[PDB]
Write a protein that binds this ligand. Sequence first.
Ligand SMILES: Nc1ncnc2c1ncn2[C@@H]1O[C@H](COP(=O)(O)OP(=O)(O)OP(O)(O)=S)[C@@H](O)[C@H]1O
Ligand SMILES: Nc1ncnc2c1ncn2[C@@H]1O[C@H](COP(=O)(O)OP(=O)(O)OP(O)(O)=S)[C@@H](O)[C@H]1O
Ligand SMILES: [Mg+2]
Ligand SMILES: [Mg+2]
Lengths: 315, 327, 254, 258, 258
Amino acid sequence: QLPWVEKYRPQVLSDIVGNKETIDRLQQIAKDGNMPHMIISGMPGIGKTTSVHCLAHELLGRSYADGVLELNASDDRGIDVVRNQIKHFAQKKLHLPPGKHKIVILDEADSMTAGAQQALRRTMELYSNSTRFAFACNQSNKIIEPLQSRCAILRYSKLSDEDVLKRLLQIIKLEDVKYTNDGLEAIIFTAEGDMRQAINNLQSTVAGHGLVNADNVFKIVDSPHPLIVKKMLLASNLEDSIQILRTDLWKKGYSSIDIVTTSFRVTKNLAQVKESVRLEMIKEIGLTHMRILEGVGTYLQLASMLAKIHKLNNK
Amino acid sequence: SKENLPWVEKYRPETLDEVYGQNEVITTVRKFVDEGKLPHLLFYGPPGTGKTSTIVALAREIYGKNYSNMVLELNASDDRGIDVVRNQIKDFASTRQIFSKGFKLIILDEADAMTNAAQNALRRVIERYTKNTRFCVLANYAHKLTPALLSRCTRFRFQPLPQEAIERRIANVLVHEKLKLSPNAEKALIELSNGDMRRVLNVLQSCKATLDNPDEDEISDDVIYECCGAPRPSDLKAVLKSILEDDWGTAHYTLNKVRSAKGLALIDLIEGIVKILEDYELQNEETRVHLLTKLADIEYSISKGGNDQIQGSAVIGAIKASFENET
Amino acid sequence: MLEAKFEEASLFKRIIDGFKDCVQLVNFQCKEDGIIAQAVDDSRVLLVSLEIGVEAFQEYRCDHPVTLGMDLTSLSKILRCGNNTDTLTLIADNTPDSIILLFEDTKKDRIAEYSLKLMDIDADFLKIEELQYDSTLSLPSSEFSKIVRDLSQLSDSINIMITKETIKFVADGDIGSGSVIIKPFVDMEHPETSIKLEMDQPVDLTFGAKYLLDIIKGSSLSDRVGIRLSSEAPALFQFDLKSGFLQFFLAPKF
Amino acid sequence: MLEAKFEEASLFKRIIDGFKDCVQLVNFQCKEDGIIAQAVDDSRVLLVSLEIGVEAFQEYRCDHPVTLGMDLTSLSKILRCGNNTDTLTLIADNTPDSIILLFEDTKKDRIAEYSLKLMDIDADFLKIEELQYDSTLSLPSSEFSKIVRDLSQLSDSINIMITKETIKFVADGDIGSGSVIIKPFVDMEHPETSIKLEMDQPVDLTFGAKYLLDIIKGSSLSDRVGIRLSSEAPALFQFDLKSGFLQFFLAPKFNDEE
Amino acid sequence: MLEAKFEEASLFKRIIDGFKDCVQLVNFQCKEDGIIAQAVDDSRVLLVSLEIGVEAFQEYRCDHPVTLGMDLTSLSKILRCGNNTDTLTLIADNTPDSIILLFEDTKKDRIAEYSLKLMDIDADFLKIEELQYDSTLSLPSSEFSKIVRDLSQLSDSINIMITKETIKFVADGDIGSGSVIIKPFVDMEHPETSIKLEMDQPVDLTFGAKYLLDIIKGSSLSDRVGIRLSSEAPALFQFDLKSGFLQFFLAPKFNDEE
Ligand SMILES: Nc1ncnc2c1ncn2[C@@H]1O[C@H](COP(=O)(O)OP(=O)(O)OP(O)(O)=S)[C@@H](O)[C@H]1O
Ligand SMILES: Nc1ncnc2c1ncn2[C@@H]1O[C@H](COP(=O)(O)OP(=O)(O)OP(O)(O)=S)[C@@H](O)[C@H]1O
Ligand SMILES: [Mg+2]
Ligand SMILES: [Mg+2]
């Protein structure tokens, strides 16, 4: 069966729960027409390719097949292609409504060579009245400044907790899945603003266990055991925290980097203890993370971090 | 002949029934293949867990003895770029088999070293050609794979080998070889493995070589500890005892003679003393706090160099001052 | 059983030269009306198809068809013993594990005999030839070879374009572009040099130069080459034999 | 513009064969009195200089000189379509980005046309030829090729020594030493086999065998080769064409200098 | 001293072509009745033995035998200057450190002279030839070359079997097996194509194909090849020269012995 990322892939700009400003901008553009050259940059899995696909579809109607030229990184996008095929498409005659234009979608624009990017300048400049260019990339710095000067720049940001939660609730309502609040919270926590990864983890948890619960999510998508990390940090005695770290995290194959990073997140988002003790625990966690990043990542460093956190909590 | 391969290669599983440790994933994969619905697999796990052996035995069970021809196996040793994908993988997926009739199998072993552009080009190959071919991605780190590629495959986490399965494999090896193993020696062997069958097989071959006999005797803990290397538990406990009870100068002399008689390293002794003192039932946790803090500081200092004698004296003084609070 | 005697070992050697390099496995089948053989390359863009009628042989006997597969490389390795003028007899029983090649000189003198190990290949002969092609043309094969050898240097793709009374081969790559334009013409001074063209519909297809280079080898079997092109199927390049033909079907580049 | 038609594509192919391998970039310039071309190797010890007068062509038209640079390898890659007997026409506008090579058979039949991309090279033609050389000699080029091919096997350096009525080529290396001694002589039975020598001063120069090997290629353009040597400048090896010549100027080894 | 002049440098070049590749060091010895040379490969399964009588030379003078050893590769490197038609003179003093090869054209014109460094080899010529061999046969050498070239492709071992009026060469390996069967016959239309066989005892020996391949080179020296086989000694393959012969003695494979 089709995955939920592809099955429930948005086909209308209203279904996108991304950045509201740019979404309404593109919606008004598709409503009025006169789409300009654009470059959409951001991070993977936030609704960049789907956004430009929806814009092109809504703007071209039934003429999407013969008015949109899609070129991904999977196809050759060198100097020869830009010289021959893109120029032939831009010079192609096509009867369109008096508010629409031919769209050239270029996915993964940050991978095009310098020669092709240089040749695309006059290609998009001489046919800017019947052909429009939409680039979708992750690093806007990889595209030359002359190309960026002839187009709008749309920087997509991370998706807040509310938007991903709303989209997951819509998907659950459309799929009739049994879930719980802590399970969705763990899913969003493991997603890190990645909507595609969130939907993928949700579908995997559903197809693997049926019930979307935090235990299952931290099991089918087991990585550092956050709740377990919180229970380890919130321990009252040193031996209990040491036994938890040994049995639950270290004896199960959790890497030290995941443990310390999950540890940082738990602390930052902690609310049981005061602000100063939280900052001191983050400072200890931060030093331990620095030491690990240097390749000294072992169990002794995490044990010393826990000992220092307990000493801070020891008044 | 197979008698020339090392024990890690000689005892490679050829069928799915010889892959121990993984039961929840092995049964699920067997059911996938028997019922027919075999999705794109993503075997994620630590080294030496049996992912490559599992997928090789799976392809053998699927296609028969002609596996080496009906399966496209790519790895980090082979050039895996975006053009390599575009040509080879797409031509393999789009075409059909030259030896029989059925779906194809592309085993992308160690695909965590592939370029981001290669994965971006392959994520649409997996989604387009999905009725005549399948994809199996083997990984040790799930952070090197793009989330788009990570979401198209069913993820199977290879857990470290437990005690029962590793002891079963050890018994199988002891049956295949004219060799005997002591129970406590077997336990010590399982302790220094961390669920890595490669290490167990290697050190088993090495201790069989250490026997020096026609194998009429047994392999005890002494053989394993002297052969596997690393400060022996005997010298470890002797140094710890001399530090805890004996005099400062005597403790220094003992540590020096122990680390210079066998050429041991100070970091290995530090880790061993940390592992041993973890079982010590101690008084108020201040001693444990001081011990862990000072030992981690000394380890981080050793990780950058310095004077070995100064660091050894620091270890001795740290352990002593930490235990002086237990009175 | 298989029992086919070629007057000159040379004919068989040139035929195999045609399968050579571009394919690894060949599936032969002898029967009452002759011998056929098919080989497909790994990427499946090229099919080499042979047909040798009973009359091409000096002696042919078949009371029971036999299908046999073999490694092309192994076969050519053995296919340089024919002295060209030697007589060659292909021999095999009804359930063969091998194919026997028997080369003999006129006199009883020297007899070179080989027993080639066979491969098991699932019998699955393709029948992809079309009733009508968009355009059909024939020209001297040496001319076609030159045309291919010219353009090959410029690109990995050579385009063939056909319009009324015009055939144009084109290559365009890094160092520049090239083209060879030929026109239909009847030479009575010797019609084996004429260039015929029958166009039902203009065609414009692109082929991988590496493959056209494999195909030109057929020049050694025939003076002329027939090229049939269609926008609906693989192109057909054909080299006629006395009672038979060697055909190369090549899929256009998408 | 450039518009030069060679009767036989073969002449141009042999000329380019001469630049081949030993140089990478060639700078051509067509003008009212013909075409010239110069190419210098990377180490700058060899200069290949060509001159083709208007009369060497079947048709030549020039109302505006054009200078064009190109990669030699690219040119030769394309220079095997001439059928030798084909007609070849070099064509270019006054401000070219390419050079067009047009090969045609007598009949309208087959037309092979190429459009070669040009390289931008700073125009800087050298004029290093001397008024007088210490010694001058000519001999059959096939003979010169053999002499070079002999000695080459023995060393990376071949010495040319000239004294009154004596020309001596010498190589000396690891396996031993070799020498070829030739004497001036007029053969009336056919003077294309004669060996002329005019010596104003004895000369003794050493050249890198790898370069002399590149130079011998000119045999395919002329029956004889002229060799002009001087202790003051690069040596000149010249192969005459009908209305033109191909020249190779080679710097003597200082002790180690090709 | 050594002083041997070959009419055509070509004869010596073909002779050396025979030692070429299969051996590295050759020990020559000139004397009153001619020149002999022996070379044994490293594995000691092949001995190459030459004999050139006084009459094979245009001029030969020897008042004092000289033995000299040399590297075969060095010699062949120098052995492509003969123009084939050049005259070749081998020259050496009684206690040489080198061997001089002097190639000259009819006219005084060109003289290529080489001085090859010699190697010191303990003089120890072998005399392993037998009085009688189990079987003896001769046939055109081009035919023998084809027979060897056929079978070589199939295996690293080629077996020669002889029975009354039958000679059979066989190879059997991975891809299959092959055999060439020849029968004795007198062709009066030209007896240089006949195949003679004298069998005193049936023989059946196996040889390493790599070695037979080295041996076939002798075809260039003689129209026919003589093959003498025995179960007691190395086989002898012989190529006759005008006054002389080139012989190859090859040890049969024991089961694995070239
Ligand atoms: N704002 C969104 N609303 C709903 N679904 C979304 C949203 N953003 C992403 N998705 C889901 O994520 C899938 C993939 O989104 P993409 O737009 O391809 O990700 P991306 O932002 O382009 O980042 P890339 O492609 O890795 S550079 C879609 O098919 C949706 O299922
Ligand atoms: N579950 C197992 N049962 C039996 N033997 C095993 C098992 N896992 C590993 N081995 C042994 O270890 C060898 C190596 O196994 P591999 O599958 O190559 O390791 P891996 O899981 O692929 O990890 P890599 O290759 O370092 S990413 C095998 O040939 C076996 O001898
Ligand atoms: Mg995208
Ligand atoms: Mg592996």
